[PDB]
Paper text:
Presequence protease (PreP), a 117 kDa mitochondrial M16C metalloprotease vital for mitochondrial proteostasis, degrades presequence peptides cleaved off from nuclear-encoded proteins and other aggregation-prone peptides, such as amyloid β (Aβ). Of the Aβ-degrading proteases, PreP belongs to the chamber-containing protease (crypt-containing peptidase, or cryptidase) family that uses a sizable catalytic chamber to engulf, unfold, and degrade their substrates. PreP-N and PreP-C, in the closed state of PreP, form an enclosed catalytic chamber to entrap and degrade monomeric amyloidogenic peptides, thereby preventing the formation of toxic aggregates. Comparison of the five cryoEM structures derived from the apo- and substrate-bound PreP reveals three key conformational states based on the degree of opening of the catalytic chamber: open (O), partially open (either pO1 or pO2), and partially closed (pC).
We also optimized the conditions for determining the structure of PreP in the presence of a five-fold molar excess of Aβ 1–40 by DSF. Grids were prepared by the chameleon, and a dataset of 3483 micrographs was processed to yield about 175,000 particles from a well-defined 3D class that was refined to a partially closed (pC) state of PreP at 3.3 Å resolution. We define the substrate-bound PreP cryoEM structures as pC state that is slightly more open than the closed (C) state crystal structures of PreP solved in the presence or absence of Aβ6. Aβ- and CS27-bound PreP structures in the pC state are nearly identical to each other and are slightly more open than crystal structures of apo or Aβ-bound PreP6. Similar to the Aβ-bound PreP crystal structure, extra-densities at the catalytic cleft and hydrophobic sites away from catalytic zinc ion within the catalytic chamber of PreP were found when Aβ was present, confirming key substrate-binding sites of PreP. Residues from both PreP-N (aa F123, F124, L127, 135–139, and M206) and PreP-C (aa R900 and Y906) form a catalytic cleft to bind aa18–22 of Aβ. The switch A and C regions in the pO states have lower resolution and higher thermal B factors than the rest of PreP structures. In comparison, the resolution and thermal B factors of these regions in the open and substrate-bound states are not profoundly different from the rest of the protein. The presence of substrate stabilizes switch A, and thus, the residues for substrate binding and catalysis, enabling the catalytic reaction. This suggests that PreP uses substrate-assisted stabilization as a mechanism for substrate catalysis.
Author numbering: 32 to 806, 847 to 1037
The structure:
Amino acid sequence: AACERALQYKLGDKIHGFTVNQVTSVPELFLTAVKLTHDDTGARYLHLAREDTNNLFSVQFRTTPMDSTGVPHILEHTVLCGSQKYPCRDPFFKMLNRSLSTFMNAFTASDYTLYPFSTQNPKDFQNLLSVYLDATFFPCLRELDFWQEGWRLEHENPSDPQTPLVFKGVVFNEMKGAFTDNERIFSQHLQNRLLPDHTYSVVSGGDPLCIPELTWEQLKQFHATHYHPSNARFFTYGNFPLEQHLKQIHEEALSKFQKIEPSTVVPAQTPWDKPREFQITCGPDSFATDPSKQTTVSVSFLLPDITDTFEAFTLSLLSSLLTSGPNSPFYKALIESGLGTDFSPDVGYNGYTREAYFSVGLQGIVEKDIETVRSLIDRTIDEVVEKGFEDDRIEALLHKIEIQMKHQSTSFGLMLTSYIASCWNHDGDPVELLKLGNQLAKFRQCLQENPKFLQEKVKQYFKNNQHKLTLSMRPDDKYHEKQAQVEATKLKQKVEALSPGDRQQIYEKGLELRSQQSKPQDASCLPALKVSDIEPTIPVTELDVVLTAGDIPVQYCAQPTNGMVYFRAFSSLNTLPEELRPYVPLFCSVLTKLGCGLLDYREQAQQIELKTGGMSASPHVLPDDSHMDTYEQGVLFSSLCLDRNLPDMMQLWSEIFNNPCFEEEEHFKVLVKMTAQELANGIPDSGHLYASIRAGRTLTPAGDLQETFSGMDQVRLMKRIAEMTDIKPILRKLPRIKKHLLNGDNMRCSVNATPQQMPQTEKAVEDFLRSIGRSTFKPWQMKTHFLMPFPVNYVGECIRTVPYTDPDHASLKILARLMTAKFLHTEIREKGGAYGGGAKLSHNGIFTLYSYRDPNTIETLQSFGKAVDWAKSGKFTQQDIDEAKLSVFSTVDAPVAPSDKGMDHFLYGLSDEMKQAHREQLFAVSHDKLLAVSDRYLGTGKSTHGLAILGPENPKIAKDPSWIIR
C-alpha cells in the first residue's frame, strides 16, 4: 500500500537532489506526510502519500503585488500560451484534449498563485507534470500573448483602421464579471480597508480601471523575480511512487536555476488604536427591489497570525460558534431582530490573509439603523462575555468537525492543497495543520481544564481589541455607468497620446495577432495518449434491491465509507396537484428547519447538528434513456450520519415525515427572506446556467419542469414571496405538500454503508419504513432577453438531439466535445474576449450552446452559426476525433466516492450493462459518423432552437420583433 511504503524514509536521505527532513503519519486521514527541500534551489516539497488513485500535483508561487495593475493574475493567466519545450500556441487548452486528467486548472489568490492538477493514469501524470514544469519555469512570454490574454488596444475590426480603438482582453472581462458580484465588491473593499498597510491594500486581481497601466516589461520583471524556484512550494498527493515525481522535477526544471533569496515576504499589518469607519457604493438590486433597504454593515475584527496553528483553530471554532445556526448568539441577536435579511459577506472566520479577520453584520437594512446594528453587535458581545456557550452546542460542533474529518470525497488532494495553501504561504508548518484529531484533543483538554476559556477568548479578541472597523455599503443605480464613463475617459487619455507611427504599429500587431489566432497550426510537439489507453472495461458494482415491508425497494451497497452511513430516499410527485409545483422548492427548503413533533426549530436544529452531519431535501427531475419526453420527477430526501447515530437520525426522519411543524411562522418568514436574498445574489455567478435553462424550457417537459424548479422563475417567485407581509397563505400550502410527499406510496430508498454496518442499517431502515404512512409534446421556438444590469453578457441556446441509449447520442457526445475544443474555444475566448464558451450534450439529449462573460452577443450567436458549418464540413483530422475520445473518457470515468456508487442506477437507472453498451458506442466513433450526425440534427430546419441571453440593454437586440424582452 502507499502509506506503508511511504512510511519508510529515513531522516537525511538525498533523493534526486532533494533531502529528507520530516515524515509523519496521519491515521485519522489515512496518509503519510513527507517534507523535502532541494539542496540548491530551496523549493519546498510536500508529499501526502495516500492509497487513492486520483493523484494530484501542485506548484505554488508567492505573488505579492504592490499595485492594482493586475500583474500576478495576468502572469498566471498568460503562461498558459506557450513555453520553450512546447512553443505551440496554447499548450493548456490543447492538453485539455490529450490527457485523462479529471482536474487540470490553476488558481491565484491574494498573496499566492497555485497550479494544481489531478489525474489517474501515471503516464498522463508524467506528461502533464512536464508540461507545467516547462510552461511555468520556462515560458516564452510573447508580447502578442499578453495582448490577447491581458489587455490590448484594437479596433472594432483589426482589418479596418477606420473604426475606434477600444480595449480588449480576457483578464479584463474576467475581472469585470468577477466584480459584477456585490459580495466580491464588499469583500474586496473590506480586505483593503482593514488591511491597508501592504499588498492586501490593492486589488490583486487588478481593477477593471487599473489594468491598462500594465506594460510588458513590468510583466517580465514580475516573472523574473517571483517565479524563480526559490519561491516554489511543491505539493503532491497520492499513491504513485515518489522517485518519479522528484526525478522528473529535478532533471527537467530545477537543474537550470540557482539559489536566490525571494524578498517577497508580506509583513504584519500595524495595529490600530481607534476604531474606524468608511463607506463604499455598489450596483443596484436586480429588478423590483425597494431602494430603501439595501444597505450592508459589518464589524470586522483582527485576529492573530496563522503561524500559530492552535490559536487559529480555536478562533475558527469560536467564530463558528458565534455565527452558525439559529442557536448562535448573533443569529438570535441580529437575524431575528427583523432588520436584515442575511449575514454579511465573508461572515465568520476568514483565515485567507496573513491574519484572520472575523466579520459579522447584516444586509438589506435601512441606513438609519446602522448604529442600531452596531449597538446590537456590541451589546451582543457583552452578553457572551457574561454567559458563555451551552455545552450541547459545543458537542454538536465537535461532532460536525469529526464528520467532516471522516467523510470520504473524490477530490481530497484538491481540498488539501486549497486548505493548506494559505497557512503554508507564510512559512507555517503545514503538517501541524493536517492533524485535526490532535487539535480537537487539545481543544477538549483546554476547554475542560478552564470553564471560562471561550469567555476569556471572546473578551480578549472582541472586547479588548481596538482594531475594529465598521464598513457600510449602499447601492448606486449608476455604479457601472460611472465605471464605464471613467474607463472611457481613460481610453481617450491613452489614445490621443499616440503618434501615427505607433498607431500603424498597433494596427499591424493586431493583424499579426489575428493571423496567429486563425491560422490552422501544429500541435504535434506536445505529448499525448491514444484511445488504446482508455480502458476497455469498467468493473461492476454490487447492488441488491431488497423489498422491505412491503413494497419499498431499498438498494444497499457495501463500500469502505470509513464507518460513515449515507441514507437517501427518492419520493415521487406524480399525484401532486399541478398548481402547487412552484412552491415545492420552497417546501424542500423549509422542510428540515421548522419543528419535528415535540421539538421547536432551535431544538430540532440542535438535534440535526448533534446526531447527523446534514439532512437536506432537494427536488430533482430525472429523464429516461428510452424516450425523449419521459421523465420521473421527485424530491430526494438525502441525509448523512455517523454509524452509531444511525437510529437517532432515522428517528429524526420519521419525526420529519409524520410530524413536521407547519405553524412556526416567524422563522418561516426569516428563512424565506434569507433564501430569496441568497438566490437573488447568485444570478451573475451562474448566468450561463440560468440562460441555458430558460432556453431549453420549451424543448422538453423535463426541461420546462426543471426550469420551474430552478430557472429564473424560481428566483422571481421567491422575490415575490419574501416581499409580502402576510405569510399565512404560503405557510398554509405546506401541509398540502406534506400530505402528498411525506409517505411511502411512490418511494424508493437507498443506503451506502460498510458491510459490517449493513444488518443494523437493514433494521433501522425497516423501522423507519414501518414508521411512515401508507396512504403530445410539440417543441416550439422562443427567444428571450433578460435585462440585467451587468457589464458582461451571458448567452444560451439549445438544440434538441436524441436521448442516451440512441446510437446517435453516442457520437454527439464526441462532436460536442470536438466543437468546444477546436472551434468554439478559439472564436469565443481567444478572439471574442469572453471568459468561456462552448457546447455540451446534456444527459437528457439537449445540445446547448453557451457563453460565459461575453463582451458581445450578436457575434456569438453568429459564431454559433459558424459552429455547425465548421462541423458539417468535416474540417477536422482523424486525430481530432482521437482528441475528443480522450476527453470524454476522462469525464465519463471521473472517479466516484464511496458515498455515491452507485447513485446513477438509483436515480437515472443505468445498469452496468447499459454503461458498457454506451462505452462501446463511443469507441465505435469514426469520421464518417460525425459527418452523418452533424448534418442530421445541428443543421438548419432540422430541429428547434430556443435562445436566451442575460446582459445589459442593447439597441440591436431590443429592436428585433422576433425577440421577447424580459
